Design a protein around this nucleic acid. Structure first.
Ligand code: FES
Ligand SMILES: [K+]
Ligand SMILES: [K+]
Ligand SMILES: [K+]
Ligand SMILES: [Mg+2]
Ligand SMILES: [Mg+2]
Ligand SMILES: [Mg+2]
Ligand SMILES: [Mg+2]
Ligand SMILES: [Mg+2]
Ligand SMILES: [Mg+2]
Ligand SMILES: [Zn+2]
Lengths: 86, 77, 54, 119, 193, 52, 295, 168, 110
RNA sequence: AAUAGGUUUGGUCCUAGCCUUUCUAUUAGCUCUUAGUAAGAUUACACAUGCAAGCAUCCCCGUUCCAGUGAGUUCACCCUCUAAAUC
C-alpha cells in the first residue's frame, strides 16, 4: 500500500505538464464560480490552432463502483459514515 | 360497526326514540331557508356541470384543438 | 345574485378579458323547480322488503 | 376497491396529532375511510388560530368547481367553509345557529340586568 | 467555577491564556473520542456535564469552562463552520456532545440572523413575471346593490315572521310536541355589560 | 392464470334468486301491523313514533 | 407631449448598464457552498475566447436590473357584510385560492372577520398567504429580524450592502413598503460613506443611481466616478440627470453653452451641484494627471 | 473495470442523452444494416451507439435489427395509421441518422417542454401529505402555525385532559 | 381504429405454418437489463391469421391487430410480408437481392 | 460489503472463510424521576360477559360501509369495451 501510494502520487501529471504536452490551455470550470472559465495552465511554447478532436463517445474504461454510486444503486451501511476530523 | 347478522343488544330492546320538540316559528323559517339555499346551490351546481362539459367538448372538438390537429397533420406530410 | 366571492371572481375575469360591462352577474333559478319534499316519488324505482319472516 | 354504488364527496380528512387537529380537503368516495384513499386533495383547513390570530383555509377553487361539476357531493362542514368564504351562500344552519346564539345571549343579558336591579 | 468572560465572551479568545492553550488551531483540534472499534458511534455522548459533574473525557466546549457558546462570540462559532462550504460540522466531526452541538447550531443560526456571521446569500429570481395590480383580486370590486343599500346578500338571510295560518298548521302537525313560539331575533348580537 | 370455476357459488346464487321469487312475502305479510304494540309482525320492528 | 423616461426605457437601461460595469471576477465570485471536484477542458485561444464570451453573456443575465416600482396601494375592499354572523366566531378566517395556474397577483385571498365582513386580504396578508401555500426559496413567512434598524447597521458596518439587498429582494416584493424602505436606507448609507463601488457589477447599481438622480443627490457618485477615471460614466450621469430634470438650471446651462463631455460636469458643478467646489477640484486634478500622461 | 468496449453505453447518464422521442404514431422501427462495407459504417455505429438511446426514450416502440439482408442499410418506421417511412442511411454518419429521424418523426423541443409542465401540475405545493408526494406532511411545519405537540407541548387549556377536568 | 388487442403493429419472423390459415410468428423486443443496463432481445410468439396461407417459415411479416381476437391465441392478422425468405426485394432500389448482392443491377432500369 | 480492522505460518506473500467495528427491531437480565407525543397479543387457537346500526309519518334506505386480520395468494397496474352508482 505504501509503495503503491508513492508510485501513484509521484507519477501524476500536473496541469502545466498537460498544457505543454498538448500545447493547449487548461481551463477549469467550477460550479461555485458558474460559467467563468479559469485558465490554470498555459503552454510555454507555441499555442496550437487546431481544436482537440471531439470524440462523440470516449472509449475510456469505467469503474463499476463509480458508476453504481452515481446511479444511486450503491447501498452500504458503512459508506458516508460520520467520523472525526482527519 | 355491526353487520346485519349481528344480534340486537338486549339493553336496547325497549328503546323508543322520541322525536324532538318543534318551534313552529323557527321551524317554518328554517324550512324556507333550505328551499332557497338548495335552489341557489342547484343553480351553481348546474353552472359547474356546464363548465366541466364545455371544457371537455372544447378540448376534443374546439377550434384551437381542431386547428392544432390539422397543423400537425400538415407538418407530418 | 351570485355568492359574494363567486361574483367578485366573475367580475374580475370580465375586466381581465377587456369587458367593461357594469351589469351585475346573476344566477338563473328559473330552471330550478323546487318540488315539495312530500311530492309523490316514483314507486317503480322503489325497493321492497326481502323475505325473512320472524 | 369497487364499492356498491356510492359517490364522490368533498369532505374534511382529519390529520395532525392529539389536541392538534388539521384537516385536508379532499374529493373521495363516500364509502372510503375518512383518512384513507382519496381522489384529489382540494385544499386544507387549520382550525387552530395561528400567531396572527387567523384560521387558514386553502381552497383549490378551480378543482372544487371541477369536482362539483362531475357529481361530487359536499359534507356539511365543507358547505359551511364555502359559506364563510363567499363561494356558496351562507348555510341555513349557520344563519339559524347565529339567531339562536343571539336569543341565548339576549336572555343572559336580561338575567344579569335583573340581578343588578335587585342588588 | 465562574468564568470572568460570561458577559463579554469574545474577550477570552483575544486573551493570552487562550493563545497559549489553543494557539491558532480550533479548540477541538486535539480532542479525540474514546470508543471501541475503528468506526465510532454515529452520535456523540448526550452531555459532558451531568448534574454538575463532568465526564472523564469532556468535549472541546465542556472541557474549557471559559468557552461560551453565544451568538456574539462569532470567532468561536466560526470554528464549527466549514470555511469553504459554510456547513456546520456534524457532532462526530469535532467531538462535541449533543447538548453543546445544539447550542452551537442555535447560536450559529442566531448570529447569521443578526448579521454578525457571514454566510452565502444567493441571488434569487422574482416571484411574479408580471407586476400589474389591476386585477380585481388586488383592486376594488364594484359593490353589489344589496351591499350599497345595506341589505343581506340574500333575503332569506333575514328573519321573516311567518303567517299565523302556517303556524297553526305546524301546531296541528306537531300537537303535543311543541316548544314555545320564538319571535324575531335581536337585530344585533347582544353583549354582557 | 385460468381461474378455477366456482360452481357452488353460481348454483347457490340461482337457488337463492329462485327461492326469493317463489317464497316472496306478500303485501298482507310485509305490511301488517299490530295496533296494540304498533309493530310489524313480519320483522318485529316498531313504527316511528310520529306514525302511531 | 413630452414624457419623462421610465426606469425600463431602453435609453436609460443602456446608460445604467454601462455605468454598472461588468467584472467577471466579481460577478462570478466563488460561492461558499457545497463543493464538487472541478472539471477541466483543453482549449485553444479561440475556444477560450468563446468560453469567455459565453461567460459575459451569462453575466449580463445575472446583472439584469430589477424593475423599480412605486409603492403598492393598500387593499381596503369589502365584498360582503353579513351581519348575522357577528359574534358567532372569535377568530377570523383567511381563505386562499390555491388553484395552481393563477398569477399570484390575481389570486383571490379573502378574509371573513368575526363581525361577518368578507374583505379582500391586505397586501401583507397576501404575501404571507402566498408563502404558506406557494413557498418560495429564500422567503420567510415571519419577517426576519435582520431588517431591523439595529441589525442593518451591523451589516452596513461590514460593507455587506449587497447581502442586505439580496435578502430584501428574496423576502419582499418589489412594490412592498418594506422592500422600498430597506433599499432607500441602503442607498443612503452608501452615499454617506462613499461606498458606491460595493454595488458595481451587480444588478443593484442602477436602482441606486435611479434613486440618487430622482432625489437630486448625485454629487457623491459623480465624485467617485471621477476619482476612478470613469469620466464616461460621470458624463452619462450628468446627462441622465438632465434627461430626468429637463427644466433645471444645469440642463439649460448645457443648452445655452452647448456643453459636451467634461464640460457638462463643470456646468452641473456650478449650477445645481451642492458640492460644486469639491467637484471642480476633483475634476481639475483629473485633467492634470491626464496631461501628465499625455506629456 | 466495466466489461466490454465503450462501457459508457451501459450507464443511465449515456442512455438519457438521447434526443429522439418518437411521435405517438411510430409503432415499429426496423433497422437493416450490413456488418461490412465502408458505406454502411454509420448504420453500424448507429446500431452500436444510438439504438440503446432510442429504445430508452421509446420503451414501447418495437426495434428489430436485421443483418446483411440487403445490399445497403436503411431504416423503416411503421406508423399506427399504417404508413411506412423508409429512410436510406447509406453513406450517412450515425449523428446524421439521429438528426434525420428526429426531424421527420421526433417530437420538437416545444412539444416536450409542454409535457414536462403538465407533469408539474400533479405535485401541487399547497398539498399536504407524505414526503413521497408532497413537500410538507402537516400544517404544523409552517412557521406561525401551532406546532406539533410532539415537539412543543400544548397549553393545558388547549388539551382535552384538562378541559374535561375543569368541566367535570 | 379501436381494438381490444394490446399490440397493434408488430414485426416478427414466421416460425410455423402447421396451423390452417394461421402463421406462428416470433416477435422480438429489446428489453433493458436493469443491473447491466444492456438491451437483450426478448422474444414472444403471436398467432396471425393468414387467409391465403402465403406465409413461409423464415420470412419477416408485419402483423396488424384485429378488432377482437378471432381465437383463443389469434389476436393479429397478416398485414404484409416484409421480407420473403430467400426472395428479398431491396426497398431502397426496388431490385431483387440475394444477401448483400444485387440479382438485378439498379442500372438496368436506370 | 467501508477509510477499514482481527484471525491460517517457524516466517513471508497470495487466496479465502470466519469474526470485529456501524445502524435499527424484538425478547431476556439488571436498573429507572417528570412532562408531551408516536407506537403497542406470539398464535387464521378456543372464547365467559357487555357493547359495537340504525334512521324515519309506516314505504323504503342503511346494516354490502367503517372497523379487523395476514390464512391463502401473480383477481391490485395499463388499454379496450361496457353495467350499476353520482350529477
Ligand atoms: S404532524 Fe403536524 S401536528 Fe403532529
Ligand atoms: K481476511
Ligand atoms: K417486553
Ligand atoms: K398473508
Ligand atoms: Mg495454509
Ligand atoms: Mg508450515
Ligand atoms: Mg429490556
Ligand atoms: Mg377495511
Ligand atoms: Mg404468519
Ligand atoms: Mg349507467
Ligand atoms: Zn460536551
Amino acid at each position: 500500500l505504501t509503495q503503491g501510494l508513492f508510485r501513484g502520487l509521484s507519477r501524476q501529471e500536473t496541469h502545466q505538464q498537460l498544457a505543454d504536452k498538448k500545447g493547449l490551455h487548461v481551463v477549469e470550470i467550477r460550479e461555485e464560480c458558474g460559467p467563468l472559465p479559469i485558465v490554470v495552465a498555459s503552454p510555454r511554447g507555441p499555442l496550437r490552432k487546431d481544436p482537440e478532436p471531439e470524440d462523440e463517445v470516449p472509449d475510456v474504461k469505467l469503474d463499476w463502483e463509480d458508476v453504481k454510486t452515481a446511479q444511486g444503486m450503491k447501498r452500504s451501511v458503512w459508506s458516508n459514515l460520520k467520523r472525526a476530523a482527519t | 360497526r355491526k353487520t346485519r347478522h349481528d344480534p340486537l343488544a338486549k339493553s336496547k330492546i325497549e328503546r323508543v326514540n322520541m322525536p324532538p320538540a318543534v318551534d313552529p316559528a323557527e321551524f317554518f323559517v328554517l324550512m324556507e331557508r333550505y328551499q332557497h339555499y338548495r335552489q341557489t346551490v342547484r343553480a351553481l351546481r348546474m353552472e359547474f356541470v356546464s363548465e366541466v362539459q364545455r371544457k371537455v367538448h372544447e378540448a376534443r372538438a374546439g377550434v384551437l384543438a381542431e386547428r392544432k390537429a390539422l397543423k400537425d397533420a400538415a407538418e407530418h406530410r | 345574485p351570485y355568492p359574494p366571492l363567486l361574483r367578485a371572481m366573475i367580475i374580475a375575469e370580465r375586466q381581465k378579458n377587456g369587458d367593461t360591462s357594469t351589469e351585475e352577474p346573476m344566477l338563473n333559478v328559473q330552471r330550478i323547480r323546487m318540488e315539495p319534499w312530500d311530492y309523490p316519488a316514483k314507486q317503480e324505482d322503489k325497493g321492497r322488503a326481502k323475505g325473512t319472516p320472524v | 376497491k369497487a364499492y356498491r354504488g356510492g359517490h364522490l364527496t368533498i369532505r374534511l380528512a382529519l390529520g395532525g396529532c392529539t389536541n392538534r387537529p388539521f384537516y385536508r380537503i379532499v374529493a373521495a368516495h363516500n364509502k372510503c375511510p375518512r383518512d384513507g384513499r382519496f381522489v384529489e386533495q382540494l385544499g386544507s383547513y387549520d382550525p387552530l388560530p395561528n400567531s396572527h390570530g387567523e384560521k387558514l383555509v386553502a381552497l383549490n377553487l378551480d378543482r372544487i368547481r371541477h369536482w362539483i361539476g362531475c357529481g361530487a357531493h359536499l359534507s356539511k362542514p365543507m358547505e359551511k367553509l364555502l359559506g364563510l368564504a363567499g363561494f356558496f351562500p351562507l348555510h341555513p344552519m349557520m344563519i339559524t345557529n347565529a339567531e339562536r346564539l343571539r336569543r341565548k345571549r339576549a336572555r343572559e343579558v336580561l338575567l344579569a340586568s335583573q340581578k343588578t336591579d335587585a342588588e | 467555577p465562574i468564568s470572568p468572560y460570561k458577559d463579554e465572551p469574545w474577550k477570552y479568545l483575544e486573551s493570552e491564556e487562550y493563545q497559549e492553550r489553543y494557539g491558532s488551531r480550533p479548540v477541538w483540534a486535539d480532542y479525540r473520542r474514546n470508543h471501541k472499534g475503528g468506526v465510532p458511534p454515529q452520535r456523540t455522548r448526550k452531555t459532558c456535564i451531568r448534574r454538575n459533574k463532568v465526564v472523564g473525557n469532556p468535549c472541546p466546549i465542556c472541557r474549557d469552562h471559559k468557552l461560551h457558546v453565544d451568538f456574539r462570540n462569532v470567532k468561536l462559532l466560526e470554528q464549527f463552520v466549514c470555511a469553504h462550504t459554510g456547513i456546520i460540522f456534524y457532532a462526530p466531526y469535532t467531538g462535541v456532545c449533543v447538548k453543546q452541538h445544539k447550542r452551537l447550531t442555535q447560536a450559529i443560526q442566531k448570529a447569521r440572523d443578526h448579521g454578525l456571521l457571514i454566510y452565502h446569500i444567493p441571488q434569487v429570481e422574482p416571484r411574479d413575471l408580471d407586476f400589474s395590480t389591476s386585477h380585481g383580486a388586488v383592486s376594488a370590486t364594484p359593490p353589489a346593490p344589496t351591499l350599497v343599500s345595506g341589505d343581506p346578500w340574500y333575503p332569506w338571510y333575514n328573519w321573516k315572521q311567518p303567517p299565523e295560518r302556517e303556524l297553526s298548521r305546524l301546531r296541528r302537525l306537531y300537537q303535543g310536541h311543541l316548544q314555545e313560539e320564538s319571535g324575531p331575533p335581536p337585530e344585533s348580537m347582544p353583549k354582557m355589560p | 392464470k385460468k381461474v378455477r370455476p366456482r360452481l357452488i357459488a353460481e348454483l347457490a346464487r340461482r337457488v337463492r334468486a329462485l327461492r326469493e321469487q317463489l317464497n316472496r312475502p306478500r303485501d298482507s305479510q310485509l305490511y301488517a301491523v299490530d295496533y296494540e304494540t304498533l309493530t310489524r309482525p313480519f320483522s318485529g320492528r316498531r313504527l316511528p313514533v310520529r306514525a302511531w | 407631449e413630452t414624457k419623462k423616461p421610465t426606469f425600463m426605457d431602453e435609453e436609460v437601461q443602456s446608460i445604467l448598464t454601462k455605468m454598472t460595469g461588468l467584472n467577471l471576477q466579481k460577478t462570478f465570485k466563488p460561492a461558499i457552498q457545497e463543493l464538487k471536484p472541478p472539471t477541466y477542458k483543453l482549449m485553444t485561444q479561440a475556444q477560450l475566447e468563446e468560453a469567455t464570451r459565453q461567460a459575459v453573456e451569462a453575466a449580463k443575465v445575472r446583472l439584469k436590473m430589477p424593475p423599480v416600482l412605486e409603492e403598492r396601494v393598500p387593499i381596503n375592499d369589502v365584498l360582503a357584510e353579513d351581519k348575522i354572523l357577528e359574534g358567532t366566531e372569535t377568530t377570523k378566517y383567511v381563505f386562499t385560492d390555491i388553484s395552481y395556474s393563477i398569477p399570484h397577483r390575481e389570486r383571490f385571498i379573502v378574509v371573513r372577520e368575526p363581525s361577518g365582513t368578507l374583505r379582500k386580504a391586505s397586501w401583507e396578508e397576501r404575501d404571507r398567504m402566498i408563502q404558506v401555500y406557494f413557498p418560495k426559496e429564500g422567503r420567510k413567512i415571519l419577517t426576519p429580524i435582520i431588517f431591523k434598524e439595529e441589525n442593518l447597521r451591523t451589516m452596513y458596518s461590514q460593507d455587506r450592502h449587497v447581502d442586505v439587498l439580496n435578502l430584501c429582494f428574496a423576502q419582499f416584493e418589489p412594490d412592498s413598503t418594506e422592500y422600498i424602505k430597506v433599499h432607500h436606507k441602503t442607498y443612503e448609507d452608501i452615499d454617506k460613506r462613499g461606498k458606491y463601488d460595493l454595488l458595481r457589477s451587480t444588478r443593484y447599481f442602477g436602482g441606486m443611481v435611479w434613486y440618487f438622480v430622482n432625489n437630486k443627490k448625485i454629487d457623491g457618485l459623480l465624485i467617485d466616478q471621477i476619482q476612478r477615471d470613469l469620466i464616461d460614466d460621470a458624463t452619462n450621469l450628468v446627462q441622465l440627470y438632465h434627461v430626468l430634470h429637463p427644466d433645471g438650471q444645469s440642463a439649460q446651462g448645457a443648452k445655452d453653452q452647448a456643453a459636451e463631455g467634461i464640460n457638462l460636469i463643470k456646468v452641473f458643478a456650478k449650477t445645481e451641484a451642492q458640492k460644486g467646489a469639491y467637484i471642480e477640484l476633483t475634476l481639475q486634478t483629473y485633467q492634470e494627471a491626464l496631461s501628465r500622461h499625455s506629456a | 473495470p466495466m466489461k466490454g468496449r465503450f462501457p459508457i453505453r451501459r450507464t443511465l447518464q449515456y442512455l438519457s442523452q438521447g434526443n429522439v422521442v418518437f411521435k405517438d404514431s411510430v409503432k415499429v422501427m426496423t433497422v437493416n444494416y450490413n456488418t461490412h462495407g465502408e458505406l454502411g459504417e454509420g448504420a453500424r455505429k448507429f446500431v452500436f451507439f444510438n439504438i440503446p438511446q432510442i429504445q430508452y426514450k421509446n420503451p414501447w416502440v418495437q426495434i428489430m435489427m436485421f443483418k446483411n439482408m440487403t445490399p445497403s442499410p436503411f431504416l423503416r418506421f411503421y406508423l399506427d395509421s399504417g404508413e411506412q417511412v423508409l429512410v436510406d442511411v447509406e453513406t450517412k454518419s450515425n449523428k446524421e441518422i439521429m438528426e434525420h429521424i428526429r426531424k421527420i418523426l421526433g417530437k420538437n423541443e416545444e412539444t416536450l417542454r409542454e409535457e414536462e409542465e403538465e407533469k408539474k401540475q400533479l405535485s401541487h405545493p399547497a398539498n399536504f401529505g407524505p414526503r413521497k408526494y408532497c413537500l410538507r406532511e402537516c400544517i404544523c411545519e409552517v412557521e406561525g402555525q401551532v406546532p406539533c405537540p410532539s415537539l412543543v407541548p400544548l397549553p393545558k387549556e388547549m388539551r382535552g385532559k384538562y378541559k374535561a377536568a375543569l368541566k367535570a | 381504429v379501436r381494438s381490444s388487442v394490446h399490440a397493434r403493429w408488430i414485426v416478427g419472423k414466421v416460425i410455423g405454418t402447421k396451423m390452417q390459415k394461421t402463421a406462428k410468428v416470433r416477435v422480438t423486443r429489446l428489453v433493458l437489463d436493469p443491473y447491466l443496463l444492456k438491451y437483450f432481445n426478448k422474444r414472444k410468439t403471436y398467432f396471425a391469421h393468414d387467409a391465403l396461407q402465403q406465409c413461409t417459415v423464415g420470412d419477416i411479416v408485419l402483423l396488424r391487430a384485429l378488432p377482437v381476437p378471432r381465437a383463443k391465441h389469434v389476436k393479429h392478422e397478416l398485414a404484409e410480408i416484409v421480407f420473403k425468405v430467400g426472395k428479398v426485394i431491396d426497398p431502397v432500389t426496388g431490385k431483387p437481392c440475394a444477401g448483400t448482392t444485387y440479382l438485378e443491377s439498379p442500372l438496368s432500369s436506370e
